[PDB]
Each structure stands twice: as C-alpha cells, then as structure tokens.
Amino acid sequence: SNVSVLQQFASGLKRAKAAKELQHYVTMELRSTRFYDQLNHHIFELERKGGILAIASLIGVEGGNATRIGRFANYLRNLLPSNDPVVMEMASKAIGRLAMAGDTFTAEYVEFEVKRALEWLGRRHAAVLVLRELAISVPTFFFQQVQPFFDNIFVAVWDPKQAIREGAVAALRACLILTTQRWYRHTFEEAEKGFDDDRIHGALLILNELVRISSMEGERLREEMEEILVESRCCRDLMEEKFDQVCQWVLKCSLIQMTILNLLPRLAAFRPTQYLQDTMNHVLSCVKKEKERTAAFQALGLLSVAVRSEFKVYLPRVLDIIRAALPPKVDATVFTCISMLARIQQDIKELLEPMLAVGLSPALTAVLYDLSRQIPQLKKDIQDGLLKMLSLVLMHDVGSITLALRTLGSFEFELTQFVRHCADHFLNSEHKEIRMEAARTCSRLLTPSVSQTAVQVVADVLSKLLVVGITDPDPDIRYCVLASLDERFDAHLAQAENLQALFVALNDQVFEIRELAICTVGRLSSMNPAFVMPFLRKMLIQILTELEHSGIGRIKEQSARMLGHLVSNAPRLIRPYMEPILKALILKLKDPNPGVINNVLATIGELAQVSGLEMRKWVDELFIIIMDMLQDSSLLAKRQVALWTLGQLVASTGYVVEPYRKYPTLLEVLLNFLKTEQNQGTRREAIRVLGLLGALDPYKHKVNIEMLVNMGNLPLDEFYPAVSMVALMRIFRDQSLSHH
C-alpha cells in the first residue's frame, strides 16, 4: 500500500507513460490514502511529468471534493510562477482536469489565478496559460473579469516575441468566443495601430479572430476540411490596407507568410475577386518554396473553398505540380484542395493513376470516399486502380499492410483469390495488429449470408475464424473475433462442430469473453434447441451454487452478472424456474460489497420483465425492502438502479394507486429527490416512476396522510425577560451546548 504505490508512481516519474497513467487510474478504481498523498508530495517537489500524470489522472476517478482541492491548489500554484516551458502543457492539462470538479471553491480559485496572471502580464507565458486554462475549464468565473483581461493583454501582446503571441491570441479567442455567446472596436483599433515584423503576425491573428467570429460559416469549412457590424463597417479600409501590404511587401519578411495564407481564404469567404489573380500569384509563389510549400497548398485549397467560380482558370498549373510530386512516392494538403475543388469529373480520371501510384498513404482513401460522396459519378476506375495496387502490395511495409487491410473495407468495391490470400495472410502473422485487422477485413468482406454455392467457402473460412478465436494465446484478438459475429450469422453457427467450440469458449478466465459467449448462445437455442437447452440448464445449476456456497465478494458478483445475462437472453428456459431463483436472490438482500447488491437489483428487473401477473404475491416484500433501502442512507446502495427496478416491477406486474394507500410516505419521498440531487438519470427515473404510479387526486392524498404568540397585552417590562428565557431554554438541550 505504501511502498508498492511509491514504486509505481516513481516508475511513472522516471505510449508507456499514458499506459502507466491508465494503470494507476485502474488501481485507484480498485481502491493507504496518507501514503498516496505523501507519494504525491514526494514526486511533486522533485520526474515532473509522472507527477503531473498521477495528480491529473486521479481527478474524476475518486470521490475527493474539498480536501483534494485544498491540497493540490498549492501544488499547482507553486509551479506556475517560475519554471521552464513545454512541460507546462501537461500542468495546464492537469489544471483543466482539476477545474472541472467544481466544489464550492471554483470562483475563488479561478479569480485568484486570473488576478495573479494579470499581475505578471517564465512569468508572462505562465499567466497566458493560466488565463487560457481558466477560460476553457471555467467559462463562468472567467467571464467575471474582462476589462483588465483586455487592457493588460493589449500591453503584453506587442512585445518582440512569438511564444507569448501564440498563447495571447488563443486567450483572446477564448474571451471573444465567451463574449459572443452571451471590445471588438478596441481589438480592431489596437490591431491596426501596431501595423503602422513583430507587430504583424499577432495583429493578423487577432483580426482573423474577429473576422472568424463575425461569420462562423467559413470556419465551419476550415475545421471540417482540417480533419480530413464591426468588421463589415470598416471593411474597405482593412481590405485596402491588407492589399497594399501584400502587394508592397513581396519579399520583405516565414511567419508573415503563414499568417497571410491563414487570412487570405477567410477574407475571401467573407466576400467572394478584387485580388483573386493577386492571391493566386502570392499562393503559387509560396508553393515552390519548401518552407512554405506545405502551407501554400493549404491557402490555395482554402481560397478555392472561399472563391468558387474563379479558381478553375488555374487548374492546369496546380495539377501540373501534383502529377510530378507523387511519382516519387507535401501533397497531403494537395488532396484536400482537390477534394475541396468539387465542393469537375473528367480530370479526376487522369488524376486517378498517380494517387494510386503513391502506394498506401493516409487521407487518400478518405479523400476519394468524400469525393465520391459529394459528386456521385466516377468510381469504377477508382476501385479498379485501388484493387490493383492493393493486390500488388499484398502479393509481396508493415504499417502499409495495416493501412491496406483498413482500406479494403471502405466504401463499395467489386473476389475468390483475395479471400484465400487473406487466409494465407493472417496465418503468416505473430502480430496483434496484423491479425486483428485481417480478421476484421475477413468478417466485413463476407457480409452476404438461400443457395448452396459459396456456402462451402463460408464454412471453411468460419471454421478457421473460430479456430483462431478460440486458440489465440493472447486475449485481445479473441475478444474482437468473437464480437465480430453479429445476429446475421445463424445458419452456420447452428452446426455441431461450431457449437461444441462455442461451448468450449465458455468457462474462460477473462469473464468478458464469458459474457459475450453466454449472450451469443442465449441468442441461439431458438433454432437448435436439442443441444443448447441442457447445457444452459447445467450452467444455471452451477451459477446458483457459486452464489450460494461461496463466501467471497468477487465470484458472487460475477455470477450475479452472468445470471442477469442468462435471464435476459433465451427466456423460455427460466419460466419453470422462477420461484426457486427469486427465493435465492431475496436471501442475498436480507442480510445484516455494493456491487453484489447492485447486480442483484439489476437482475430482479429483468426477471420482472420476463414475467408478469405471475410475480404478483412477491411484490409486497420486494416493495418493503426497496422502500427501506430508499431512505436510510446507512444502507447506501445506489438510487438509480433501485428506482429503475421499482418502476420495472410496477409497470410489468400491474400495481397502481394501492401503493399510495399502503405506504403513505411513498409520495413525500419521491418528490424530495427532485429538490436534493444533481443527476439527470436519477431525476428522470423519479419522474418516470411518478408517471407510472399515476396522478392522484389531492383529496385522496389528504385522506391518506411563540414569541409572536407571546405578544398579547403584557407590558414591555415583562416581555423582555420572558422571550430571553424561551430562547435560552431552547438552546439548553445538548448538541450546540457541546461548546455553549
């Protein structure tokens, strides 16, 4: 508890880091506390990456509300003032994760941090990060102070630095988004004042923020393609200034070029010409330069988006470059521009050959799929070329094979040799990645599933898939192969050699393959009841034993979950066994681990659903038990599941109006939950139960269920002495007395 946790968090301090953080989160979920806090202190003072991981991951996992904030606030405050950059990114993420807790201290903490950040504005960038994180995590209390924010950022922004600008513009963006959802003139004034190289790339980004917020349409295209009054009034002046700056400063001064490329398409989208040929010249000149080749194509594509009916004139130029770049295989954005061009069918035909000559590269197949989406026409040639290149790849480096397998299932296609080649493929494979994708591709490509042709091929392939899924030494592809079999496969899983293998799959160790297999078999047994029924009876007998004759808190819960699944699926096996099962479950509830109770309650609801008008005579006791649990938080089980099961009982069996008379406090209880909790699920369940019980007439509800007084005609001289005694005697009865 002490040394083991210390060693684990030290290993975290000294891909692998994220896995360690996830493992620590899981270990905490399983769960000493003093030693955990001492370990946090040990790693914080000294390394910092693992400490940040440990501090951040545990937030939102455990149930610490106030003491955790009170302790970690000092830790977070100590690092920001003076420290190196880069590593801050993770500290900022930790701050964001912490700030989303919200326990009666967010206002104070956020305002304190914002004010101390404004004070500084290794000092300025920390303030910028603090402001950005508080704007993101806490939109409410960040909005409290805006004027100092703007005033001080307008001073700190224009220093001769790039790092401080990159974050200041983001903070301005967050503040302006919050302002718009619920200043602009000052922003424009200060942006234009500076321009009259340092005072360029920040003002341009600020003007970009203003323009983008003015019209969200252009940014809704920018963001989508990336994944694959104020400004209007002062439009002429800004446009003229920008045009003059672009025309005059041809080679005056990397950063300015990327800012220009960012601004040009959004400005064009604001108004689709004035300087189109000029924008073409600028962008194309920027292309041939490698330092700007990547961003130049971004600008070209974004402007093609912005300007619709004037880009076509320059199709031959851009394409001439593209067909030259790929034969060797920068074009990652070329493909985005081409896709944006259609948002134009005969040139794509010629464009087909070199994209496929690229080999397997990301964003190519998605680009082609989106192209086929918007413009439905040319596809057969695309499919032919794609299949030919995939064949050339698979006849014969590793990630390329993975991407080929991923691609072989995207959008439509037009295959006997391929299936057997994949059979050879996943057989020559000691790899969790190649095998998983190969199995997924094989499952997807056999979508068709009454003719006795291809049936033999299906039988052989399915036999091989079952063999691999049951014999895999490692667990992670067994779970994928098993889950890949959906409701569509019923004809071939009703065989004997396959049902025996499925039975073997049961009684496994991971318990998840167990749930999946039991669910699958339960889904079956309506087609071949000869084999499944006795096996399920035997498994039911075994499950009722583990729960009855084992004093362990884990196997009981697992068996309860497995009983719930079995009851949910294949219900024709449980009707003759309703009385025994129920009698067992109730016993576990009548005892003087929360998971066991939760699973028992969950399975009772499914039992209720499977029956009805046959579970009556058992409703009164289950009603007394669940009522006793609803109040009396000493036996603090969950409330969502309890309300759910109560509603299921009432709905399925049929039991209305009478409960109000029998349990007169059931209404005073159910309404209180509406004014005491902060859960959507709990409130919705309470409303649903109130609806199911039915509206009750207020008269029936009624049937079911001093100091001022002191002031009469007594003179004031006698009034003061009394009321004093009344109050003092009211206090004089234990409790507060403790100190009084």
Place this chain on the structure above:
Amino acid sequence: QCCEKWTLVNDETQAKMARMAAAAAWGLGQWDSMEEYTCMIPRDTHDGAFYRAVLALHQDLFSLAQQCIDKARDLLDAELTAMAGESYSRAYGAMVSCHMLSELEEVIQYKLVPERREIIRQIWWERLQGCQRIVEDWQKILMVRSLVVSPHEDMRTWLKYASLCGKSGRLALAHKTLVLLLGVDPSRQLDHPLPTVHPQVTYAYMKNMWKSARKIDAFQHMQHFVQTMQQQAQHAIATEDQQHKQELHKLMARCFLKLGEWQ
C-alpha cells in the same frame, strides 16, 4: 380559423398559433396539416417534444419517439420542481403531464407485443380511476390513448366519460359521444325506434334525453325498450347464456324503477 389566416399573419403570432393549430389538426385527424403546424413550434419547449414524439409514433420511428420523450422529461423537470416546492395541489398540472408521458411510453409495447394487450387495457382502466374528475384531463388522456384503441373496443370508459359530462352542464358533448357510440342519429329519424344493439348505450341515451325537454318521448321509448327486453329474454334463453341472462335481468330492474319514478 387557423386555416383561413396563415399567410396573412406574422411569424411572432405564427408561433403562438402553432400549438392550437396542431392540437385541432390532431383532434380532427388530418395528419397533413399537423406536421406543417408542428414544425413551426420551437424545439426547446416541452410541447414541441411532445408533438414530435406523437408524430414519430404515428410514423413508426420508435427510437426517435424515445429520444423525444426523454427530452420532454428533461424540459419538464424545471416546472415540476418549481411548483412542487409549495403544496401538492399546485403541482397537479405537471403530474398530469407525467401521466401522459408514461402512457405514451406504454403505447409502444402495444404495437410490438400482441400477447400484452388485454393487460395493458386493464391497467389503463384501473389507473384512470385514481385521477380527478375534471373533463379536460380526461379529454387529453383519452386523446393520447386513441392512437391504438378505437371507442368501439372499450365501451365502459366512454360511457363513464359521457356520464361525467352529463352531471356538468355540457349535455351536447354527451349527445355527441352517445351518437358516435350508437352508430346512427335517432334524432334525425324521429319516426323510427331506437336501435336495440348494445342495450346499455340505449339506456344511457334515454336518460340523457329525459335530462332534456323530451320527457314524454323518453317515457314512450322506455316502455317499448322494456317490452323488447322481455321478449328477447324469453326468446334467447339458453343454459350457456345464463351470465347474459343475469346481466339482462339486472338491467330490466333498473329500467322499471325509472318508469315508476317518471310516472
């Protein structure tokens, strides 16, 4: 009125029309105009989710209906909490809405499980009796249930509705209900006698007419009703039809008393 003035109107007032227009369209049964009126209501309101769920159920889009019902519950939490804080009397209006939402949920499982219909009908009958005896709540609840059940498939609920309308000064509505239960309008065909199928409906109709000015006509009709009942009882006596006989005799007694009390 809603049909006459749609393009002659502003958008602000269009929004306020939309709810009543949709309610009227649903009441009449014209499903074409209901969608047009519904799409105008804001999506954030409880009523918008309610009516979208109703349309989804009509078009067999159960998942969409469940989503809409959930959203309606989330939108109702605020009103229910606000009013519930003081007295249970002030919270009744929202309780009726919770009742309607649960009934709408139960409407599903009626189009999917044929083995679960009679139990649902019995549950509905038993639940309706615990509510207050106001006419508008009954109207709303019956309109909600009318999506899968026609009046002819459950007579007693509509008979009780008509009787409730009678004790209030709304005899015309009871007349309409009894007319749409009989299958004809005896008011038009005065020269003809009352129909004899479903004797309970005829008995209720005769006492509604007596409630109005037609007293002597009610007496004359009741005499013939008793004669026909006696003749039918004699001519259709069978050991199998003993329960029927028991229900027939109990009816005749209730008739006879009225005669005397009127005489």
